[PDB]
RNA sequence: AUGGCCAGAAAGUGGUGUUGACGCAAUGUGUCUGCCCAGUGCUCUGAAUGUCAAAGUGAAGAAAUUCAACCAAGCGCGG
C-alpha cells in the first residue's frame, strides 16, 4: 500500500505525447484495487483526472470496474469529485448504467447529506423523461418505489391522472408525500428542485380551501423566511406553485409572504421565474399600501 | 484481542490421551534421571 | 381488518350489519336495543374482515357517558379501523339532523387517525336532494374537514350496501398494504425479510422466449355441464351407488366394472397365475 | 388428540424405552433416545415398546444444538427386529431410524436418508411425500 | 429517583384548578436538569399525592401553583396549550394527552406556539431543533425556561444546509 | 376449476391420487368420497382407475406420468399391473421401473413437454422416461430439495414451486419449462406442493385447509375455472397477497 | 449471584465480606428478603435483566460472579445434562459484560460430554480453571463446580465463542476403520450414530481406474458400492484396456458389481488384481 | 416517537427508556499553524481562420478547425 500510493503519487504530480502513456502507465498500476483507491482522497484526485484525461476505452473499463458499489460511491464523502466528473461527460451507456443501481433509494439517499445535492445534479441534467418520473413516483409512496410499474399507459409521474385511475389510494399517497416534504423542511433543506416538484403536485392535488391546504400553506410560511421562499421562487416548479399559493392564499398569509420577500428583489428580477411570481403578485395582490412600502420602494 | 479458534478447539478435545501419555512418560524420564 | 358502525340510537346500524354479515343482532324500533357489542364476519377479495355493531351515543360529554354507550366509545378509541358513522337524514331516528351533526364533531378526537365514511342510512325515505340548502352545506362542509367521506345507502331496499361495503373494504386494504411496506422498507434501505419473501410471491417467472405450450384439452370437458347436487337429474355417482347398496363398510367395489377387453364377457375371469 | 395412529396392523415390536435408534432427516439431529411411547398400555413391569409408523417421544443426544433443548415426537422409519406383514412375508431393516415429526404428523425435515418402511409411509402422509424409497 | 412525571387524566385537573405545594429540588446523576419534588391533594381522599416534576429556571419552593385548565398564566403552573396564549415559551410538552409529558426535558430547551388552530383544535409547537409541529390543544405543558443554562456553547452549522442557504 | 377435497379426513391429496390429461389413479379405501369427487370434475372424460401399488394406498407418490405414459415402481405386483393396463386405453404405455428410489411420484414432475427428476436417478431411469413419457429429461432440485415430485407442481399451463424459491431459480426454471411459475404454498402453508394437490390442464384437486388466497394462486398459475388466470392477474391484483402472506 | 432460588448463597455471602460490600442477586422465582442482599425478581436469560443489573451495578465492575442453577430433573438425563450446561454458558456470557480484569468467576456443571467443551471457553477466556466438587456434594450427584479466574478483559470477544450453537456442536466424525471394514467384514459393528449430511441415498460408485489408480485402495473398498466399468461421457482408453485384461474374470466382475457383500477372500482378490493390472500398467508399486 | 441504534427469522418481541436534540448515538483526529520554490496539470476565460440568417426594423448569433508557460481568478496541490 506504502509503495503503491507513493508511485502513483508521481504519476499524479506529472499529470497535476507524454500524457497517454501515463494514463495506460497509471490504469495498469491501478488495476484491481479501485475501491481502495476511491476510499484514498489523494487517489480520488487521481481519478477524475485520469477519467478527463482517459482514452475511449479506458472509461468504459473503469466503469465495468466500478460496477458493484455506484450507490457506495454516492455515500462515500470523497467520491463526489470523481461522481460529478463521470455524469458531465455526455455518453448515452454511461448515463444508463448509473441511475439503475441509484433507483430505488431516493429517500436515503436525498436524506444522506452529501448524496441529496449528487441526486440532484443527475436528475437536473441529464436526466430523461423516463428515469426522472419514476425517482418523483418513488417520491409519492414506497409502492411505487418498490414495484415496477404495471401495463398501464399511466407511466408518468402526475398525481391527478394516477389517482383518477385508482381513487383509493388518494389517502396513503398524499400522507407519504406531505410527511416526506414536511422532514425536508424541518430539515432546512429547501434548495432542491425534485423537491419542489413534489411540493408542486402535492398542493394542486389538493382540494380547493381544505383544512389540510390550510395546514401545507402555513407549514410553508413558518420558516426564517431568508432561504425557502427565494430558491422555491427560482426554480420552475416552486415558481407556479408558489403563484397557487398566493391566489388561494389569505391577506394575512400574503402579508407575510412579502415580509419574507426582502433585501433580494435585484437577483430575484434577473432570474428567469421569480419576475414571474411577483408578475402574479402585483395583480392578486389587493394591500396596496403594504404594496407601496415595500415592493416599490426597492424597486424604484 | 482473541476469537474463535477452530483448530485449538479440535486439539484441546481430541487429544486427553495423548496429553496423559505425554505426562506419564515425563515422569518415567524424570524418574529414571 | 375491522369495520365499525357507530352512530346514534335508532339509524339503522343493527340492521346493516345484518345485511353484509350474519351476526345475530337485534333490529327493534326502540332505542336501546343492542346494549352489547357484536361482532360479524365478511369476506372481500378472498379476506375476512370483522364489523362491530355498537350501541349508540348521545350527545353528551365523556364524562356522564353510561355504562352502555362507553362499551360505544372504547371500540373507537382502542381499536384501529374504518369508521361507518351513520346519519338519518330524516328524523325517523327520534333525533334531530343538527344533534347528528354536534355528535360526531364531538367524537372526532376518538376517530384521530383513522377512516372515518359518513353513510346516510334509511334514504328510501326520503333522500339528500331533499334537503334545504343551509343543511347540504353542513352535511358536505363535513367531508370539507379530514378525510371523511360521505356515501348514501338504504338497508331496507338493500340500495347502497354493497357499494357502501365494498367502498370501505377496498379502502382498509389499500391502507393496511401500505402500512406494511413501509414497516418492511427499514430507514437504511435495506428491505426487511419479510417483505423480500412477499416479493417472491409476487412474482411471475415468464420464459424468456414468450412461446407457449400446446395444451390437450378434450372437446368433451367444453360441453360438460357443472354437478349439482339439488338437481334432480344429476349424475348418478358412485357414494350414491354405495349409500343404496350398504354403507361405508358393507359395499363392495367391483373393480372389473370399468376394465375395457376386445370381448366384454372376458371380465369376471379368473385369470390363471400358476402352472 | 394423542398421536396414535388409527388403522395399524399388529407387528413385532423391537424398540423398548430407552433405545437409540438414528435419525433420518436433515433437520440436524443424529441419533434419537426413546423414552416414552404413544398409544402404550398398562401392564406391570412392561417396557413401553414401538415399532415402524409409531409416534414415540424421543430426545436428541448428538446433533445440532437446537433440537437438543427439548423432547420431540418422532416415528419409527426402519427396524432391525423382524417382522410380518400380512402378505406373510417376514422382513428387517439393517438400522433403526426414525423422523422428528410434530404431534399432527408433520415432518420437521425436509429429506429422508435411506429407505422407509411401507406401515411408515402409509400411516403418515408427510412422511409418505419425503421419502425417496419405500419397501 | 423517580421519573418526571405529570399527574394522572382525571375531571378535576381537565374542569378545574388543583394547589398544590413543593418542597424542595433533588439533583441526581445522569442529567443536568434538577428534579422537583413537589406534594399534591387529592380531590377525593385525604392523601397527598409524591410526584416529581422538572424544576424550571427562576422558579424556587414554596408555591402554591395551579394545576388545571384555568390556571394562572405565570411560571410554576402547567396549562393545556389552548389556554395558553400566542408566542408562550412551554417547556416538557405533551405529545398526546396522557403521555405525562414527552418533548423538551433537557436542561435549558424550550417550546413556544407560533399560532392556535380553533376548529379541530390543533395547537402549534416549534421544537428546540427547529422543527415545526402540530400536537393537540388539550395536551398540557410546564411553562417557562427548565433550569440548567449554558446556551453560550451550541453550534448550529451544517456543511449541507449552508450550501442550500442564501 | 380448483376443487378441495380430503381423502379420508386428511388434506394432501397429491399422496393419495395422481391427475393427468388422460387418466386419473384414484387410491382404493374405505367409502367412495375420494372416487366421487373426481367424478363429479371428470364426468367420464377421462378414465378414473382404483388402483393399489405395492400393496399401498399412496399410489400418488408412487407413480408419475403424463397423457403418454405411466411409470411404476419394481414393488408393484402383476395383478397391480393387469389392472391398470385393462383400465386404461391402449394409447398410454405402462412399464414397470427397476429404480433404486422406488418413489418415482417424489423424484418425477411431468407435465406433456418436459420432465424434472431427481439428480441421483439411474442414467437408465433417465433413458426409459424420455421413452414412455416421451418428455425432455432434466435434472435439476427445487429450491435445494432433491424430491421435485413433492414440492413442485406442473402442468401446461403453469407451474407452482417451493414457497421459498428465490426470484433467479424460478427464471431458470421458467425458461428450462416453457411455462409461466410462481411460489405458492398450498393447505394452509404446507410447502409440499405435490403431495398436497394435483393438476392437469383443465382441473385441480387441493385440500380442504388451502386459503381462499392461496386457491386464487393456484387458479391463477393453472389457468382454471374459465375467466382469466394467467398468472398476469396475479401481478395486477397483489394486495390480498401481500396482506395475506406477510 | 445469577440463581439464588432460596438464597442460601446470598446469605453465606452476606455473612463473610468486607465490610460496606455489594451483593445482587437474581432468581425467577421470589426471594424472601435477607439484609444486606439485593434480591431481583427478573429472569436472566432476557437482555431487560442486562439494563435493570447495569442500573443497580453504577459504573462499578464486578470481583465475583456466581453460578448456582439446575433445570427440571427427570427426562433421561439426557435432556437435563445438556439444559444445564447451556445456562452455565449463558451465566458466563453474562459474566463477561460485568466483571473486572482479574475477576473470578464459579459456575456449576453437569458432568456429561458437554463437561470439556464448556471448559474449554474458560480456557481462552479465562487464565486459571479448576473443578472441584467441595464434599457437601452428594457423592452420588453428577453435579460438580468449575472455577475459573483470570479473566482476560479483551477489547471485544467474538460472539461465536459466547454462542451455545458454535461451543455445543458435536466434533467432526472420526476417520472410520476402513481396514476392519475390509478385513473383518463378517462383524456386526452396529450403528447407532447419524447418517452423515450429503450422502442421502446410501449409496455410490466409482470406476475401476480410480480404483487402480487410488493411493488407499482399502478406503474405496470399504466405503463404496459399486465399481463400475461404464465407458464414461467422453470415453476412457483405461476402462477399455482394463475390461479387456484377462486377469479380471468373471469372479472379479461379479464382485465388483456389490461390495457390501463380500467377504475377506473376495477383497483380498481384488487386491492382488489390483496389483496385478498396475504392474501391467507400470505403477509405482 | 407512526422515531434512531442494538439484538431477535419475525413479532402485537423487546432493550436503550427511569430517554426527548446540551440528550442519545455513529465516522475521522490524537499531524496543526508559519514561511520558502525564476515549482506543477488544468477549469473558467481568452485568440485566430473560413461560412450563413438576422420582428415588414432593436440583440450582431451560430456552424467547422487550430490553439493558450508568465502578462490582476479558481480547483488543486508536491518538496
Ligand atoms: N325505512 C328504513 N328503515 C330502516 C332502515 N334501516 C333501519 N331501519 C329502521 O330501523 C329500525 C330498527 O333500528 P336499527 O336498524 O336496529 O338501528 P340501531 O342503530 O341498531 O338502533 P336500535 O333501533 O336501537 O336497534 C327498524 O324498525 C327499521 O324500520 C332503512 O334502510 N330504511
Known amino acids: 500500500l506504502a509503495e503503491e500510493l507513493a508511485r502513483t503519487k508521481q504519476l499524479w504530480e506529472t499529470l497535476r505525447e507524454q500524457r497517454q502513456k501515463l494514463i495506460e502507465e497509471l490504469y495498469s498500476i491501478i488495476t484491481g484495487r479501485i475501491k481502495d483507491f476511491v476510499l484514498k482522497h489523494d487517489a480520488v484526485r487521481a481519478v477524475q483526472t485520469a477519467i478527463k484525461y482517459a482514452t475511449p476505452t479506458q472509461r468504459r473499463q473503469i466503469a465495468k470496474e466500478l460496477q458493484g458499489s455506484y450507490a457506495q460511491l454516492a455515500e462515500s464523502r470523497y467520491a463526489k469529485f470523481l461522481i460529478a466528473k463521470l455524469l458531465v461527460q455526455n455518453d448515452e451507456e454511461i448515463r444508463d448504467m448509473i441511475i439503475p443501481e441509484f433507483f430505488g433509494k431516493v429517500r436515503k439517499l436525498i436524506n444522506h447529506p452529501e448524496a441529496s445535492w449528487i441526486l440532484d445534479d443527475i436528475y437536473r441534467t441529464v436526466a430523461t423523461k423516463q428515469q426522472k418520473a419514476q425517482m418523483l413516483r418513488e417520491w409519492y409512496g414506497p409502492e411505487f418505489a418498490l414495484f415496477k410499474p404495471e401495463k398501464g399507459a399511466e407511466a408518468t409521474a402526475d398525481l391527478s391522472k394516477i389517482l383518477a385511475e385508482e381513487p383509493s389510494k388518494r389517502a396513503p399517497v398524499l400522507k407519504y408525500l406531505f410527511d416526506m416534504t414536511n422532514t425536508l423542511i424541518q430539515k432546512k433543506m429547501t434548495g432542491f428542485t425534485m423537491l419542489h416538484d413534489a411540493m408542486l403536485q402535492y398542493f394542486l392535488n389538493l382540494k380547493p380551501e381544505s383544512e389540510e391546504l390550510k395546514e401545507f400553506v402555513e407549514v410553508i410560511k413558518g420558516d426564517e423566511g431568508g432561504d425557502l421562499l427565494k430558491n422555491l421562487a427560482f426554480t420552475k416548479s416552486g415558481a407556479r406553485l408558489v403563484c397557487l399559493l398566493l391566489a388561494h392564499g389569505n391577506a394575512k398569509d400574503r402579508k407575510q409572504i412579502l415580509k419574507t420577500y426582502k433585501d433580494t428583489f435585484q437577483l430575484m428580477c434577473g432570474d428567469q421565474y421569480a419576475h414571474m411570481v411577483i408578475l402574479t403578485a402585483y395583480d392578486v395582490i389587493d394591500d396596496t399600501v403594504m404594496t407601496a412600502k415595500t415592493i416599490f420602494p426597492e424597486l424604484l | 484481542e482473541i476469537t474463535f479458534d477452530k483448530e485449538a478447539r479440535i486439539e484441546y478435545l481430541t487429544g486427553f490421551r495423548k496429553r496423559k501419555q505425554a505426562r506419564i512418560k515425563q515422569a518415567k524420564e524424570i524418574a529414571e534421571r | 381488518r375491522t369495520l365499525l358502525v357507530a352512530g346514534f340510537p335508532n339509524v339503522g346500524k343493527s340492521s346493516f350489519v345484518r345485511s353484509v354479515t350474519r351476526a345475530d343482532t337485534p333490529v327493534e324500533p326502540y332505542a336501546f336495543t343492542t346494549k352489547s357489542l357484536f361482532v360479524g364476519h365478511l369476506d372481500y377479495k378472498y379476506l375476512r374482515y370483522q364489523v362491530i355493531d355498537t350501541p349508540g351515543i348521545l350527545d353528551h360529554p365523556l364524562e356522564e357517558m353510561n355504562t352502555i354507550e362507553m362499551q360505544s366509545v372504547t371500540a373507537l378509541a382502542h381499536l384501529r379501523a374504518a369508521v361507518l358513522y351513520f346519519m338519518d337524514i330524516s328524523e325517523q331516528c327520534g333525533f334531530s339532523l343538527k344533534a347528528q351533526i354536534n355528535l360526531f364533531k364531538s367524537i372526532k378526537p376518538l376517530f384521530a387517525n383513522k377512516m372515518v365514511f359518513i353513510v346516510l342510512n334509511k334514504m328510501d325515505i326520503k333522500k339528500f336532494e331533499e334537503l334545504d340548502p343551509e343543511m347540504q352545506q353542513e352535511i358536505n362542509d363535513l367531508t370539507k374537514s379530514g378525510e371523511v367521506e360521505i356515501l348514501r345507502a338504504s338497508c331496507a331496499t338493500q340500495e347502497g350496501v354493497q357499494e357502501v361495503k365494498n367502498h370501505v373494504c377496498e379502502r382498509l386494504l389499500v391502507e393496511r398494504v401500505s402500512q406494511k411496506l413501509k414497516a418492511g422498507t427499514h430507514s437504511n434501505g435495506n428491505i426487511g425479510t419479510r417483505l423480500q419473501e412477499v416479493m417472491a410471491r409476487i412474482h411471475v417467472a415468464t420464459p424468456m422466449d414468450g412461446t407457449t405450450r400446446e395444451t390437450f384439452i378434450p372437446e368433451a370437458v367444453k360441453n360438460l355441464k357443472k354437478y349439482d347436487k339439488n338437481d334432480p337429474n344429476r349424475r348418478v355417482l358412485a357414494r350414491d351407488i354405495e349409500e343404496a347398496n350398504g354403507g361405508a363398510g358393507v359395499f363392495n367395489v367391483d373393480l372389473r366394472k370399468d376394465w375395457i377387453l376386445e370381448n366384454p364377457e372376458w371380465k369376471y375371469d379368473k385369470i390363471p397365475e400358476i402352472f | 388428540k394423542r398421536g396414535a395412529p388409527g388403522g395399524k396392523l399388529k407387528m413385532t415390536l423391537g424398540l423398548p424405552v430407552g433405545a437409540i435408534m438414528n435419525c433420518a432427516d436433515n433437520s440436524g439431529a443424529r441419533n434419537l433416545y426413546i423414552i416414552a411411547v404413544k398409544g402404550a398400555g398398562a401392564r406391570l413391569n412392561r417396557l413401553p415398546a414401538g415399532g415402524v409408523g409409531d409416534m414415540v417421544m424421543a430426545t436428541v443426544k448428538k446433533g445440532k444444538p437446537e433440537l437438543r433443548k427439548k423432547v420431540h415426537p418422532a416415528v419409527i422409519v426402519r427396524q432391525a427386529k423382524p417382522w410380518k406383514r400380512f402378505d406373510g412375508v417376514f422382513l428387517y431393516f439393517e438400522d433403526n431410524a426414525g423422523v422428528i415429526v410434530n404431534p399432527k404428523g408433520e415432518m420437521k425435515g425436509s429429506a429422508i436418508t435411506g429407505p422407509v418402511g411401507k406401515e411408515a409411509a402409509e400411516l403418515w402422509p408427510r412422511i409418505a411425500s419425503n421419502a425417496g424409497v419405500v419397501m | ?166 | 376449476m380448483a376443487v378441495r377435497a380430503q381423502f379420508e379426513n386428511s388434506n394432501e391429496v397429491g399422496v393419495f391420487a395422481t391427475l393427468t390429461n388422460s387418466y386419473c389413479l384414484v387410491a382404493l379405501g374405505a367409502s367412495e368420497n375420494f372416487y366421487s369427487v373426481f367424478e363429479a370434475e371428470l364426468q367420464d372424460v377421462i378414465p378414473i382407475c382404483r388402483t393399489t401399488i405395492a400393496g399401498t394406498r399412496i399410489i400418488g407418490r408412487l407413480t408419475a406420468g403424463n397423457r403418454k405414459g405411466l411409470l411404476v415402481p419394481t414393488t408393484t405386483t402383476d395383478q397391480e399391473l393387469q389392472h391398470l393396463r385393462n383400465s386404461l386405453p391402449d394409447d398410454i404405455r405402462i412399464q414397470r421401473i427397476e429404480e433404486r428410489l422406488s418413489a418415482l411420484g417424489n423424484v418425477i414432475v411431468c407435465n406433456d413437454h418436459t420432465a424434472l427428476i431427481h439428480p441421483d436417478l439411474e442414467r437408465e431411469t433417465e433413458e426409459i422416461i424420455a421413452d414412455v413419457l416421451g418428455v425432455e429429461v432434466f435434472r435439476q432440485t427445487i429450491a435445494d430439495h432433491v424430491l421435485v415430485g413433492s414440492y413442485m407442481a406442473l402442468s401446461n399451463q403453469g407451474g407452482l414451486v417451493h414457497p421459498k424459491t428465490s426470484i433467479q431459480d424460478q427464471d431458470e426454471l421458467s425458461s428450462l419449462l416453457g411455462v409461466p411459475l410462481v411460489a405458492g404454498s398450498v393447505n394452509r402453508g404446507s410447502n409440499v406442493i405435490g403431495g398436497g394437490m394435483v393438476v392437469n390442464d383443465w382441473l385441480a384437486v387441493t385440500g380442504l385447509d388451502t386459503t381462499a388466497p392461496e386457491l386464487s394462486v393456484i387458479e391463477s398459475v393453472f389457468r382454471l375455472g374459465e375467466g382469466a388466470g394467467p398468472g398476469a392477474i396475479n401481478t395486477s391484483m397483489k394486495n390480498t397477497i401481500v396482506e395475506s402472506f406477510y | 449471584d445469577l440463581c439464588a432460588a432460596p438464597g442460601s448463597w446470598c446469605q453465606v455471602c452476606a455473612e463473610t465480606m468486607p465490610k460496606d460490600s455489594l451483593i445482587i442477586g437474581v432468581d425467577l422465582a421470589p426471594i424472601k428478603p435477607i439484609p444486606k442482599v439485593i434480591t431481583f425478581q427478573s429472569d436472566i436469560t432476557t437482555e431487560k435483566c442486562r439494563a435493570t443489573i447495569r442500573s443497580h451495578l453504577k459504573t462499578w465492575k464486578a470481583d465475583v460472579v456466581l453460578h448456582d442453577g439446575a433445570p427440571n430433573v427427570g427426562t433421561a438425563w439426557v435432556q437435563d445434562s445438556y439444559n444445564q450446561a447451556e445456562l452455565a454458558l449463558h451465566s458466563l456470557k453474562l459474566a463477561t459484560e460485568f466483571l473486572i480484569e482479574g475477576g473470578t468467576f464459579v459456575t456449576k456443571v453437569f458432568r456429561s460430554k458437554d463437561y470439556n467443551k464448556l471448559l474449554w471457553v474458560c480456557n481462552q477466556l479465562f487464565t486459571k480453571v479448576e473443578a472441584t466438587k467441595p464434599p457437601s456434594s452428594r457423592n452420588v450427584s453428577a453435579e460438580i463446580f468449575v472455577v475459573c479466574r483470570g479473566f482476560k478483559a479483551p477489547k471485544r470477544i467474538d460472539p461465536r465463542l459466547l454462542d451455545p450453537r458454535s461451543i455445543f456442536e458435536d466434533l467432526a466424525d472420526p476417520a472410520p476403520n476402513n481396514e476392519a471394514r475390509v478385513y473383518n467384514p463378517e462383524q456386526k459393528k452396529r450403528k447407532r450414530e447419524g447418517y452423515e449430511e450429503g450422502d442421502y441415498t446410501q449409496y455410490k460408485e466409482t470406476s475401476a481406474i480410480e480404483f487402480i489408480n487410488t493411493t488407499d485402495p482399502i478406503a474405496i473398498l470399504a466405503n463404496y458400492n459399486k465399481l463400475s466399468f461404464e465407458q464414461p461421457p467422453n470415453g476412457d482408453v483405461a476402462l477399455a484396456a482394463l475390461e479387456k485384461l484377462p486377469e479380471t474374470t468373471k469372479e472379479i466382475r461379479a464382485c465388483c458389481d456389490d461390495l457390501k457383500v463380500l467377504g475377506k477372500k473376495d477383497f483380498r482378490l481384488l487386491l492382488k488384481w489390483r496389483l496385478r493390472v498396475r504392474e501391467i500398467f507400470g505403477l509405482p508399486s
Open chain 5, 1 to 166: 429517583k423517580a421519573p418526571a412525571k405529570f399527574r394522572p387524566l382525571d375531571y378535576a385537573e381537565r374542569h378545574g384548578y388543583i394547589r398544590g405545594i413543593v418542597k424542595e429540588i433533588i439533583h441526581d446523576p445522569g442529567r443536568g436538569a434538577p428534579l422537583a419534588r413537589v406534594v399534591f391533594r387529592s380531590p377525593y381522599k385525604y392523601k397527598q399525592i409524591t410526584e416529581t416534576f422538572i424544576a424550571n429556571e427562576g422558579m424556587y419552593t414554596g408555591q402554591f401553583i395551579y394545576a388545571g385548565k384555568n390556571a394562572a398564566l405565570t411560571v410554576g403552573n402547567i396549562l393545556p396549550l389552548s389556554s395558553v396564549p400566542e408566542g408562550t415559551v412551554v417547556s416538557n410538552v405533551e405529545e398526546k394527552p396522557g403521555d405525562r409529558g414527552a418533548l423538551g426535558r433537557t436542561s435549558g430547551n424550550y417550546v413556544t406556539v407560533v399560532g392556535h388552530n380553533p376548529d379541530e383544535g390543533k395547537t402549534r409547537i416549534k421544537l428546540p431543533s427547529g422543527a415545526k409541529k402540530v400536537v393537540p390543544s388539550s395536551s398540557r405543558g410546564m411553562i417557562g425556561i427548565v433550569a440548567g443554562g449554558g446556551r453560550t456553547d451550541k453550534p448550529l452549522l451544517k456543511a449541507s444546509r449552508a450550501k442550500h442557504k442564501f
